[PDB]
Design a protein around this nucleic acid. Structure first.
Lengths: 123, 112, 150, 70, 123
RNA sequence: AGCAAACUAAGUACCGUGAGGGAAAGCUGAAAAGAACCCCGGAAGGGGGAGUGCAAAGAGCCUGAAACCGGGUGGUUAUACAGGGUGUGGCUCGAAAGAAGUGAACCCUUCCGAAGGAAAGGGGCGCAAGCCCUUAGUACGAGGAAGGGCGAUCGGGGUCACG
RNA sequence: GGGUCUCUACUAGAGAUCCUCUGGUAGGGGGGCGCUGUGAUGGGGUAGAAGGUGGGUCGUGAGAUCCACUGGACCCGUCACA
């Protein structure tokens, strides 16, 4: 539990955006990463003042990787039958209700999860 | 890719005899290079009531004089009836692990 | 219409669509009378019609030179008399005065609280140049909107 | 979506705070409490197409469910 | 509800909530268990309001014993989420203490008198 | 896209003296209920107020992106550069989806401490800058662990100044 | 990457532990993300869908998912295939 901000809070993350994302709007509006390959490219050569390349040394600690910022394990629930298959219990999961479920089924879906003691993100 | 070949390899490795660990290593060869043996070669290099362990398939070329017990992954159907007609026996690698004499067998030969 | 601040019953609106006036000339006309009283704006615009004073140009001011009739609104000595553009703005303000009469507002105390010009619709024609080449002869139309308040 | 008026924004005391509810425009009544399904969604602005009801115009037997919230 | 001693009628619970709302708006209020406990120790609090749905229970288990030994009234409420929102918070509050109701003095003492009947026959 | 051709006339319009070449273009609504009437205008499926409809991006009619232009919000500008990333500050936005009264943020105390690691004081050597023994592997030192105080904002977004 | 072990109707997953290695063009090799359709399915979702605009969170990343508004009838998770 106390090992969640020792790796995250001090190390503000890089964005890893494609080259020339700020000169052309056709490249800047995608907001995604693409590997540099030009023979003279400067992010490929890793020159000074040029926004790091993507590397495997940037991964996160395996014991906190992929967790909800509340410290639990997120589960995306699309039906009421997904609640009955709760593993272990309410101690280690946070429920993510699907966005497309209509308002009438949501009322019954939230009631079912509340009595089980589960924690809901988008309640 | 076979479900039963994979579960057989995982249980041979757990065995505590170097004979069975070598069979599991040999069964992991590329399919194009998997081992086999014909009846004529078992006859030449064995005596009566031996135990032959083949890490592949037993095929039916040649004839058999003496009775032997042969343990193999699979048998050709013409080859299976050649062995039984001469007074021998056939087992699968699955049953050979559990057999009580095959717990502490003696005079065992590994062939290919 | 933009504003969502003044109560609705104190406003008068109008729009004039697809007129033969450019946003280049109408940018400066709309900026000079923005925030004026209706009476001051209407009489200033009529002085530009017979060239008693010049209307200033801040943005699209190529081909316009300096006048003797500019000291009020600073950085520019450059002005002109955009006659065809003024005449459409006066027609728009006539429509907005009428709409305020129907609501029962006081005409003597009306203020121009919003005015802006927009791009309208283009008529696409072509010219005939030398050596068998062809170019554009477009006609750009525009909208103008105004809101009057107290 | 709010132009169909199946969702109604409640004006809680002229504040920069509007509460969104689901209004069952059926039930044919005039002062029933079941026409209002209370969501928990405090809007910070009022959308253009939203239909607004004043807090005092609600039935008195639903005002309690909201004034505790307020 | 092990720390909960005596059942309270629901017509009384909602009067507590609207008492806190007026106390928040015209008086001094302390929110949170870490601050209500210090309120009893310094004997600066006059009302202590305890939720009935805390989990785990040892956060507010010490309040009923530490409060009655100093002769200070206390009242229960069914839910903590409503108790937190009555105080002006966007989050639940487990316990609340009132410093001085201000213009809410006229009804807090009414709460004190009514709860005596329930706790008077508790022996 | 599918045949060149889903449509007011496809080998149709249109181009060539001719053999010949060869386009573009779909969508209101369940129902026209297709906006009566009144004020403005020369007129205009033109403006304003109305009315119809579950709903008017209402005839230039499904949804309605970007480039581009106009108006406004928040920062900022006439002694001085390119442009993004970082550090320290100013002003702003912060309902939800992020943390948080079961305690945000910030202050005090104690303890452990990797690689590394002093000086002041005392004594000795050198013309001198300085060096050697002791102080002392002490003070300290990345990180890490406990307690106390105060108590409601932080993470995040926009922009400006300076390195 | 390699050695040594555990569990699972296993073309793969989930783990424990010990040793060592970490620039890269041409090029060779291993794993994954995304788009449209088909056979299935514990399977589901919808007048509240797809799409659009702005913003949260997760992942080194390709990407995934949620929130508010817009919109008015269809669309997705998993396994295999093209």
């Amino acid at each position: 539990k106390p090992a969640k901000k020792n790796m995250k809070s001090p190390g503000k993350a890089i964005k890893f955006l494609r080259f020339d994302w700020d000169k052309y709007y056709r490249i800047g509006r995608q907001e995604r990463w693409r590997k540099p390959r030009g023979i003279d490219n400067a992010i490929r050569l890793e020159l000074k003042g040029y926004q790091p390349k993507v590397k495997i040394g940037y991964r996160t600690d395996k014991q906190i990787r992929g967790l909800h910022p509340s410290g639990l394990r997120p589960i995306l629930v699309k039906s009421v039958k997904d609640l009955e298959a709760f593993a272990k219990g309410k101690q280690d999961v946070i429920i993510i209700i699907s966005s497309t479920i209509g308002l009438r089924k949501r009322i019954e879906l939230i009631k079912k999860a509340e009595e089980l003691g589960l924690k809901i993100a988008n309640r | 890719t076979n479900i039963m070949l994979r579960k057989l390899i995982t249980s041979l490795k757990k065995q505590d005899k170097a004979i069975w660990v070598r069979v599991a290593e040999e069964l992991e060869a590329p399919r194009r290079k998997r081992a086999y043996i014909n009846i004529y070669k078992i006859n030449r290099y064995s005596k009566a009531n031996d135990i032959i362990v083949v890490p592949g398939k037993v095929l039916g070329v040649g004839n058999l004089d003496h009775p032997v017990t042969v343990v193999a992954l699979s048998f050709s159907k013409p080859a299976k009836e050649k062995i039984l007609r001469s007074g021998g026996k056939v087992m699968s690698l699955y049953k050979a692990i559990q057999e009580l004499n095959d717990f502490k067998g003696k005079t065992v030969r590994l062939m290919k | 219409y933009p504003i969502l601040s003044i109560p609705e019953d104190k406003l008068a609106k109008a729009v004039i669509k697809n007129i033969d006036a450019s946003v280049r000339d109408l940018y400066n006309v709309c900026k000079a009378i923005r925030g004026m009283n209706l009476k001051e704006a209407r009489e200033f615009l009529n002085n530009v019609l017979e060239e008693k004073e010049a209307l200033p140009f801040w943005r699209y001011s190529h081909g316009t030179s300096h006048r003797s009739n500019i000291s009020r609104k600073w950085k520019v000595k450059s002005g002109r008399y955009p006659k065809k553009a003024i005449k459409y703005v006066l027609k728009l303000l006539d429509n907005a005065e009428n709409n305020a009469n129907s609501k029962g507002l006081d005409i003597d105390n009306l203020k121009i609280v919003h005015i802006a010009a927009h791009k309208g619709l283009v008529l696409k024609r072509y010219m005939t140049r030398a050596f068998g080449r062809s170019t554009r002869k477009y006609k750009y139309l525009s909208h103008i909107e105004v809101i009057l308040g107290e | 979506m709010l132009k169909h008026q199946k969702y109604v924004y409640v004006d809680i005391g002229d504040q920069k705070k509007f509460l969104k509810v689901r209004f069952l425009k059926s039930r044919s009544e005039n002062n029933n409490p079941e026409a209002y399904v209370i969501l928990d969604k405090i809007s910070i602005k009022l959308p253009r197409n939203a239909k607004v009801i004043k807090y005092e115009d609600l039935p008195a037997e639903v005002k309690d469910k909201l004034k505790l919230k307020l | 509800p092990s720390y909960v001693k005596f059942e309270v009628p629901q017509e009384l619970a909602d009067k507590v909530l609207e008492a806190v709302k007026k106390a928040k708006d015209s008086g001094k209020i302390k929110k949170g268990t870490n601050e209500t406990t210090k309120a009893v120790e310094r004997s600066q609090a006059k009302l202590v309001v305890i939720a009935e749905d805390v989990q785990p229970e040892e956060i507010v288990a010490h309040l009923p014993l530490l409060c009655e030994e100093k002769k200070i009234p206390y009242v229960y409420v069914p839910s903590k989420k409503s108790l937190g929102e009555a105080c002006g918070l966007q989050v639940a509050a487990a316990s609340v203490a009132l410093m001085d109701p201000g213009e809410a003095k006229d009804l807090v003492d009414e709460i004190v008198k009514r709860v005596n009947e329930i706790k008077g026959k508790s022996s």
